[PDB]
Structure 1
């Protein structure tokens, strides 16, 4: 498939245009064109924010999924409401493993203790403007135990847990009611492998 590699690109320099909580960097490079020749110098504004771990809580016995509801204002301008239905997720820090961030966030966000876990897919959200990569895991859970609303809330992570059938959640994806990349991808994956996973677990 892909011909070219890292030796076919010369990164001239990287510069931080802005550095706050996240970073906005500028990549200046030259690369091979699809005719051999090397291009001129190209500039790219790249959003640097680290990488994420995602966990799809799936109850094989009940054939259910556990969703996380929390506000995401970046969704404001193009959605009817900023509050989205999502998967458990968290940023991967200094040498943490994807599985551990996923399992830890399952406790913090949904109050669930994941049992067996399995790798699904790893994707780049939008490779044209950000370096962010998200790695999905499917974790065996007991929907029956998820937490409820926090009396005293975490204001930068106020979550409401939703438990729904596997089919329901998938239909919402097709209907557009669930439309964040991690959820759409994980839920489509589940829809293509649910019987094999149900047979493997329990």
Structure 2
């Protein structure tokens, strides 16, 4: 295991001055206007830049995977924001929830697998961590895979209302390829699993 080099990005936090964050909205979550100047590639300083950034905490994401049965547990809940681009706003997702307090991502991954899927997790691994849409929100989501008994996954759970589904991994991945699953975190988790299932099954 050899980590990679620092390169080829060299501009860091010493190359940016956040002039100010201007609160544009304060409800359940926030729109804030980042006002900033940054170094440019040609060595010159920038004009002041104004960026509207949706701010609303960060998420833990569990991929419930049963290594014995080679199955995944998906969850189903409505995402109203999906309405305008999707046939249905009910989406097939991974266990996930926002991180708060002194919670680690393991804390929240595990907590949410009970709240949303009634699922007790065994061994866990870190998968990947990703920024959802950096152009327009600071949200970071951190994904863990969790060893789960898929035979215990049933029922409705949860203003949250969630249904539980058990499919084989291969079916979960085909639904990615073919567009049935298409939320960022499921696609990332389920492509990650497809590149790793054999080594993971072997290890577990």
Normalising by structure 2, we get a TM-score of 0.95
- Find the partner of 2:20 among 13, 18, 31: 13
Whole-angstrom CA distance in 2 between matches of 1:31 and 1:114: 44
Whole-angstrom CA distance in 1 between matches of 2:98 and 2:43: 39
Go from structure 1 to structure 2 and tell me whether the alpha carbon gap of 1:150 and 1:46 turns closer, same or farther (over 3 Å shift): closer
User: For each residue in 1:40-90, what CA deviation from the matched residue of structure 2 results, as whole angstroms up to 9, or x when unmatched?
Assistant: 000000000100000000000000000000000000000000000000000
Distance apart, 1:149 and its partner CA: 2.5
- Number of matched pairs: 197
SS at match of 2:75: strand
SS at match of 2:116: helix
Whole-angstrom CA distance in 2 between matches of 1:3 and 1:195: 37
Whole-angstrom CA distance in 2 between matches of 1:157 and 1:190: 27
SS at match of 1:35: coil
Whole-angstrom CA distance in 2 between matches of 1:145 and 1:100: 20
Distance apart, 1:147 and its partner CA: 2.8
Corresponding residue number in structure 1 for 2:79: 72
SS at match of 1:34: coil
Task: Give unpaired runs (5+ residues) of structure 1.
Answer: none
Verify the 8 A CA contact 2:66 2:149 in the aligned structure 1. yes
Distance apart, 1:150 and its partner CA: 5.2
Whole-angstrom CA distance in 2 between matches of 1:131 and 1:8: 19
User: For each residue in 1:101-126, what CA deviation from the matched residue of structure 2 results, as whole angstroms up to 9, or x when unmatched?
Assistant: 00010011111100001100000000
Corresponding residue number in structure 2 for 1:185: 188
Normalising by structure 1, we get a TM-score of 0.96
User: For each residue in 1:134-159, what CA deviation from the matched residue of structure 2 results, as whole angstroms up to 9, or x when unmatched?
Assistant: 000000000000131259xxxx2101
Task: Give unpaired runs (5+ residues) of structure 2.
Answer: 1-7
SS at match of 1:110: coil
Whole-angstrom CA distance in 1 between matches of 2:36 and 2:165: 46
Poorly superposed stretches of 4+, deviation over 3 Å: none
Corresponding residue number in structure 2 for 1:160: 163
Whole-angstrom CA distance in 1 between matches of 2:135 and 2:72: 31
1:197 aligns with 2:200: yes
Verify the 8 A CA contact 2:34 2:52 in the aligned structure 1. yes
Distance apart, 1:15 and its partner CA: 1.1
